[PDB]
């Protein structure tokens, strides 16, 4: 039966750095790209939608535009990996990766963000 | 493009009563049951999972045990309707209905629950 798994369910990252969080799913030697759907979101903001083997940019959230991409190279290994550059305090929260490949499943990932005072203060008046 | 829609995105219900919330999805011609997946959850608890045309209760949250059913009659109309009997204060919150049928999509529904004092008080301690 179809199942998504996470190697890690918690990431602790530094304000200003780059992050890759991952969802694994089974591919039996070889990917059928036509049938694959990958959707990632955080608190109901869309981050990427990979359908018919291509990213759809239209429905991506503001926060994420050209900061967030799916590492397409990994897909044939059964790895939907999300890369986000220049982490902000507001990137902290619970992420879900939703995968349709025959079956469907999803998983959740918690992101914590450490930040120095000047950064936390700017966010404190948001 | 495949889309799930909600006729209503907010329900206000009374403690002790029965609730049916709804999610529409497109069905052309005849319904293909083999391909259909319907999943409902609230705050990461599984409520029902209908796959290969059958409910799988093994994975159900114990809150919902024998209170929750999917109206199977409605499916061929393109309606995934969830019924919960004997609504409790703890059933208030955000529900998501997730559907795979060719494409995949989800929607969100908020349920509020009115309750009298005696009920709220018992919940206030437990
Ligand atoms: C993920 C999914 C599902 C899966 C849900 C699900 C979930 C869990 C629950 N997962 C865990 C947490 C661990 O495994 C558990 O706590 O158990 C268990 C069982 C199932 C099932 F069988 F019902 F599907 C159902 C329909 C659609 C989608 C879906 C996929 C891709 C999408 C999309 C929707 O819409 C936007 C575009 O991209």
Question: What keywords describe this structure?
Answer:
6-stranded mixed sheet; homodimer; binds ligand A1IXH; Immunoglobulin-like; 9 strands; 126 residues
Commentary on this structure:
It is classed as immune system. Two copies of one chain form a homodimer. By secondary structure, chain A is mainly β. Chain A has a single domain (10-124), classed as Immunoglobulin-like, CATH 2.60.40.10. Chain A contains one helix and nine strands. The first copy, chain A, has one helix at residues 117-124, and strands spanning 10-14, 19-24, 37-42, 45-51, 54-55, 68-70, 79-84, 93-101, 103-114. Chain A has a six-stranded mixed β-sheet, with no helix packed on it. Chain A has a three-stranded antiparallel β-sheet with strand order 2-7-6, with no helix packed on it. In chain A, strand 4 (45-51) and strand 5 (54-55) form a beta hairpin. Chain A is elongated and about 50 Å long. The A-B interface holds A 37, 39, 44, 51, 98, 100, 103-104, 106, 108 and B 37, 39, 44, 51, 98, 100, 103-104, 106, 108. Bound molecules: ligand A1IXH. The ligand Cc1c(/C=C/c2cc(CN[C@](C)(CO)C(=O)O)ccc2C(F)(F)F)cccc1-c1ccc2c(c1)OCCO2 sits between chains B (37, 39, 46, 49, 51, 59, 98-100, 104-106) and A (37, 39, 98-100, 104-107).
